[PDB]
Amino acid sequence: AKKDQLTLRGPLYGNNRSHSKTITRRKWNVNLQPCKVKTADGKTTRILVSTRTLRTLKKHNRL
Amino acid sequence: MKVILKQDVSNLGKRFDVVDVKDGYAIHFLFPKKLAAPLTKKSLQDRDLFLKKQQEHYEINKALSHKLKEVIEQTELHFSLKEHNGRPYGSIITKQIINQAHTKGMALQKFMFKDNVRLGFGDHEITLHIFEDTTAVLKVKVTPD
RNA sequence: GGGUAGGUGGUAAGAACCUCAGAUCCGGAGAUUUCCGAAUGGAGCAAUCCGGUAGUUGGAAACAGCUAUCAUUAAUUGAUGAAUAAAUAGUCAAUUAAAGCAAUACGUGGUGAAGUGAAACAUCUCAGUAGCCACAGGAAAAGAAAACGAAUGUGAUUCCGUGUGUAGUGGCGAGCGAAAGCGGAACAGGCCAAACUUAUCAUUAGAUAGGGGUUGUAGGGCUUGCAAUGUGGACUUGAAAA
RNA sequence: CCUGAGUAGCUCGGAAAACGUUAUUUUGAGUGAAUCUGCCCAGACCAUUGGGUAAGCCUAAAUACUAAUUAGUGACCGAUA
RNA sequence: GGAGAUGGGGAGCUGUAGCGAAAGCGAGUUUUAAAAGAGCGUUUGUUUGUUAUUAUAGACCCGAAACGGGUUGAGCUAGUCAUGAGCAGGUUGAAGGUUGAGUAACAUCAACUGGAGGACCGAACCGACUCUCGUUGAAACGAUAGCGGAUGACUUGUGAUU
RNA sequence: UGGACCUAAGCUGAGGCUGAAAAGCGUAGGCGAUGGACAACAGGUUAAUAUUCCUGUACUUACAGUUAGACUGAUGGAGUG
RNA sequence: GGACUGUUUAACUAAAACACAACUCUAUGCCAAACCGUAAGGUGAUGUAUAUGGGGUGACACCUGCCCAGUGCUGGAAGGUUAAAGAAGGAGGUUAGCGCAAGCGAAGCUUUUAACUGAAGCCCCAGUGAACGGCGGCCGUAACUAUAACGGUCCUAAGGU
RNA sequence: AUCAGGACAUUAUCAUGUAGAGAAUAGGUAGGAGCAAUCGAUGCAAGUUCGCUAGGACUUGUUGAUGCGAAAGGUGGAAUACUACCCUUGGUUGUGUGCUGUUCUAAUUGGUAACUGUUAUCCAGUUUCAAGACAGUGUUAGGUGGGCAGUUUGACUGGGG
RNA sequence: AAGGGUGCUUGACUGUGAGACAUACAGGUCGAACAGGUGAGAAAUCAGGUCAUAGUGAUCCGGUGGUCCAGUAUGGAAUGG
RNA sequence: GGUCUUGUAGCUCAGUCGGUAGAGCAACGGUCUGAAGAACCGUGUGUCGGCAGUUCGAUUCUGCCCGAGACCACCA
């Protein structure tokens, strides 16, 4: 499971090339960022989060 | 990143405003010394609320900072050197001030008391700034064994 | 409850029994139901070994007999707690749901190729197929208008038949292939949030609890006014009747 | 005064739609507004007109199938079936 | 509807005029300046059943070497970790040290103890180098005869793992 | 001979870590002899077993009252094996 | 011929084969370098250049001659080639309107690839042969001459000691 | 966050320049036949640049109101000043565009160490030790890349090649 | 003469072509003649490339010019015919 | 197809922007020297790939062609 806990976004399996007549498959690994979390009680250190989720946290001022 | 700061002009822009400029990640929001609160109120009243809260919070910070220098200057800080042949090994770092603070119980942060990383023997004195309206002094003494 | 003059499950001969006071047999409600096995006190080679607690009986005791209990996760409750006062992870106790299996069939989602034809083949095809996984229910998924689509036109979603093998699409091959339109099966649309209003939270509440409110021909909020006890279940009880 | 924002978009890859990526639906990275006064749509995209308010929730039918229980049928097979 | 014929049920479907790329027209259409010539036209049924062919479906039928996915396997074999055990018997004498001779002392020499080998001879044990035998056998890998190694890159008892 | 003892690589595995799912890895724990520790030999007899069945000679580790001596001492540290 | 002890197709080939001592080069200063694995995780390793794996050869002794033309390598920058992207600027269209026709045309948007920058590699150069790989012909010349030390030329980077 | 240094734009900056004849270093194009003239000329001094050792330019001193012999006469294929222009090289600051080297810590990374949980080498945290916005990692787009996948590799023919 | 040379212009035209050649098809070949404007030459007529038999490359796909054609609701535009 | 570069003598190297065709070797003559040497001065080899413009006047400038070395071509 390469994803954060607060949001559930699964890595999509797709394709890859810039040139060919055939087809292949690869995944997209969602970018994961270890950042401190914010809450009034206890645990506030490293948790993995998604980048878009981080940006939403920044504009929503979730500290 | 952030659009609000906790303080007015200190060394650069990004005052205690509804909207502030930003250039990448900063301690302008990370540090508890200077943070930002969620907006969650911004239609027209938010700027007046932030301004009034700015003056009131500056005044209350000044009052509590005076009390905190008084209470921390009254107290005494003593430790012990576990030494061999009169050679100092004890660590004198922010640990000690955090310990003495948690015995007393005031809210601080470990990057807020910036203290030099070194050793010390005998009585010595330290001058440090706690906030941007503060200038304080603290004393450390140690006993040999 | 019904019904009966024998039966003692199949290889049937003998035993030895009860039975005409109702068995045998049929159905309903049941009690109990060894071990292992999701198997869960712990372990292990499934039909094995060691247990712990609380009782209870015997015996000085040891130990032996009959009961329940003692696994994990998640959520909730209480105690609990290090750096570091608090808090914090964690620790134990209590309550509640699993976790399995199968109807080899149907549901969704995620995974996911080949030989196959193309007279080769790497395109397309074989198909999201096989197979795998996870979660399901008697079914599920789907589903109430940024729907349509061109009109003086309809008005949740699904399936059936015409449209049609069409318009298109494509190493423009092999092929793939509609969506509207029309005709039927059924047809119920309701419910939050958001404006505002009542209390707590250090009224920095941004959270909770309650009232109003559930959208196109715009609606709701706002100061009011007029009229009304209505019909509906998608549903709670008991009662009756079939 | 309110009617659902990292949202519609857009760029880069992508995927389902007849589609073999094109308006239409989804998004992995990046970036990024408006508020019924507008937004989108009528397969590029403007103007006029129309259509209705997505970025909330649930919703029985209209169905596929017979492992079962009972009854029954078979221009069903009769022991190499 | 006795899991039947049928009755209902025009939604469509072939024809009723065709041309062309279509616009658009039309007993004409396209070319063009053209009506000329050339192009197809100048009404020539449909619903069934039965045969014949055919379209795709395992499609007159049995035949592969394969391919991909999913399972099973270290009791064979190869490798390794642990735990063990055995290897008849007999040869061989490297050092080292000690004694004595020797020398100025060494060097050197005569020796004694002593035991070193991917040592040797060679049983059990391993292997299978060689000829014969059988080779639709006693036996899906041997039998007789020989042979090499056989205190070490030896073997195998068991467990385990790949 | 083996359990009621522990371990040899190895296995499993509360938490935990990683990974589409499956699953893999791994802490503390727990299993795993062919290892390590523990007290019985001679003989007799059935057609069938026998150190076990029977005669002899013993030992052993625990519980219980008891007498005499005595303060002992573990999951803790060290030797031992 | 190989040093040898020793190893290999159970079941048709045991050796010129394998293998070792030993020799040589090379990537690496530790979380290594090599990897096994989709990532954690693990060996090399509770390792630390006398370490470590890989490429070649294979007692002992002696030699290792030429050629960086090209290939693969090391280092460098003079210059040119250079995607992706960042964004000078231009063009197309609608049309509020100006407008007699035309045409022009503010407004938002669509289509547009650009000016310039833009990595490494490549072309380039210096080195590199117990790393790939190759190691030529011709002509005459010394008192018989066949002989060619000795000298000359075409090719190539080079002509077998 | 942080300072500094080097490139491309160009304001504004001045210099910029030999065939022969040309009194001639001459980059040329065309109006101008002018103006420097207390701000003052032919001509001389010290300094800067320079390139022809010879061309050209500027500050101060000096000549004193004139001449520039390159305004016009006069010469040269290409005429003199100025006027606007296209070339120039170098430097000077004006900032825009991205580049490199800085410092810090504060994101992030730890297979540093210690402590508690925990009888425990995994982990949770705190600190330390470090690095340090490098860099893991994600995405996009290049390179390299038989380690690997899919396959490919016509025919005729007195057999085929 | 279909050879040579001179002069004149440029039909190496357009829309077409019954009728034939041979013909797996595609494909290839010869042209009667009509209508329009033509040049040569008074006319006659000729002139629908070279005296011929060789001198070639299928379609999609893409581009260019015109385009009385269409243009997804409309007008345009895109885009295609 | 663009984007850059390259062309000279009998062979191998040059090349003041327009203001010109130059070393070495290939062949010969000569000079130095007791002699042979040896070395060197040099007759010569030059429309500077070609074609049209520029400039008083072109081998290098402009445009074209010829001989050539390099980076670029595919729908899921």
Curated annotation (Swiss-Prot), chain A:
Lipid metabolism found in the keyword field: no
Gene3D superfamilies: Ribosomal protein L28/L24 (2.30.170.40)
GO CC terms: ribonucleoprotein complex; ribosome
Region called Disordered, residue ranges: 1-20
Alphabetical keyword list: Ribonucleoprotein, Ribosomal protein
Chain segments annotated as coiled-coil in the UniProt record: none
A GO term, aspect molecular function: structural constituent of ribosome
One Gene Ontology term from the biological process aspect of the record: translation
Cysteines paired by S-S bonds: none
Any Pfam family: Ribosomal_L28
Protein origin, superkingdom: Bacteria
Alphabetized PANTHER family for the sequence: 50S RIBOSOMAL PROTEIN L28, LARGE RIBOSOMAL SUBUNIT PROTEIN BL28A
Family the entry assigns: Belongs to the bacterial ribosomal protein bL28 family.
Name of the protein this chain belongs to: Large ribosomal subunit protein bL28
The organism of origin for this protein: Mycoplasma pneumoniae (strain ATCC 29342 / M129 / Subtype 1) (Mycoplasmoides pneumoniae)
Top-level taxonomy: Bacteria, Bacillati, Mycoplasmatota, Mycoplasmoidales, Mycoplasmoidaceae
Gene that encodes it: rpmB
UniProtKB/Swiss-Prot annotation, chain B:
Record's keyword annotation contains DNA-binding: no
A single Gene Ontology CC term: ribosome
Domain of life: Bacteria
Alphabetical UniProt keywords: Ribonucleoprotein, Ribosomal protein, RNA-binding, rRNA-binding
Entry's Gene Ontology molecular function annotations: rRNA binding; structural constituent of ribosome
BP-aspect Gene Ontology terms: translation
Function, in words: Binds to the 23S rRNA.
PANTHER family (UniProt xref): 50S RIBOSOMAL PROTEIN L9
Family: Belongs to the bacterial ribosomal protein bL9 family.
Name the record gives this protein: Large ribosomal subunit protein bL9
The organism's taxonomic lineage, starting at the top: Bacteria, Bacillati, Mycoplasmatota, Mycoplasmoidales, Mycoplasmoidaceae
